[PDB]
Amino acid sequence: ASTDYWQNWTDGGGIVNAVNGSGGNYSVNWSNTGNFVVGKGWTTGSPFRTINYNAGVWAPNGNGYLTLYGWTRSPLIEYYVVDSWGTYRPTGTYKGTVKSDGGTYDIYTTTRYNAPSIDGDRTTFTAYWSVRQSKRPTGSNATITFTNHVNAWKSHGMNLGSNWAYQVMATEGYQSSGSSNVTVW
Template identity: 35%
Template sequence: MNYRLTTSLLTSALILGIAGCAKPPAADAPSPQAAATHAAALPAKPPISKFKAYTQRFDGQTLLTQGHATGHVGDVFFTHWKDGGEASFKLDEQGNFMIDWIGGDYNYVGGPGWESGDRNRVIGYRLDEDSGASYATLYGWGYDKTMDPADPAHLVEYYIVQRWAREPGQGGEQGVTFTSNGVEYTTYRTVRTQKPSINNTATFYQYWSRPKEQMPLGVDHKIIFADHVKAWEASGWKLPDLDNFDASDDPTYQVFAIEVFLVENSGTAAGRVWDAGK
């Protein structure tokens, strides 16, 4: 992800707007006024004080079109971020989502999930539509503030890619091949040097797991995250803390994300995400 979280974007996140897009929300979606009133009336979930953008909570189907927004729809956490262009994110309390984008020279990443990572989480998802996203992926961050910031291992951005239009882990170091839930994956590691991240501008690693074949649409899938952590560690790549608010700009969230960047064509990705370990 080309992560450019700036002060202005955080400010816009605090002034959350719910707007229309090419595909209108369902008839029972809340009005902007009702959603704003509801968000103000409900307590934050979770009660995070450091990252004001994360104190938003909405009820019912919610449509996001602004530059940056994070929070909860019911109990479902979400992140929605773009550095330009036109992309929108619709989400309900059951984890059903739809992301629409218009092609152009920009980066978008968004999706439903959890406000912190969990090494033992089992993620369930189903994609019913994907018309060319750069990546459909489990996505998140790990961060250890006690480690030397000059060591790229102190901050890790990870991808367990399920579908792609761009080559995952391109130009990176190859690790191991392993099987998880009947799917064969290969690990890769790349490095980002002095790039924007959840902790300001930093040098950090990206860990990748790429399946041998792209996962089909219209089918329920499971991602057993612990298997990928073990495979990365078998490659000698340690994953730092997944559950903290220590970074400067964002906590270490974990979401099923749709990422699009430098896309020529417009498209849609739609499906559902849930905790398959319960």
């Protein structure tokens, strides 16, 4: 599927060279950054979408996530499906696990306090996470059957908002350096 959304946010820290490539391809080179999120996907997320991607390059030199990323409003919720990471594996309050697309994921919830949100400014909100137990190999055609995660989260009282915002396969970094090249469809 053709992606119609390009995500390129940074808090202004360090160097973030985000390249909007052809089709669903994009690349990022970052150095000594603050927090940033870059990726390609869809303007309107869907709980039934099946995301395909191929990370030709995944080379974080510190804290960085290769993850499905999106938001919902009413209520405001930030969500993640993390397939790979750098030096730090993200975790939070353990809820359970879900098997999907050949891997096993731990389900977590966290709360972000006075954090920047999709609407700008800062606020307190909840984040839903599915984090692979081990890093998914990169350079191959990978699939994320999002409906499996949505359904697993629901079973743990983790319900998403009614207003869907963007949904992208992103590269998120935090006070680190690295490189990534990903193709989404």
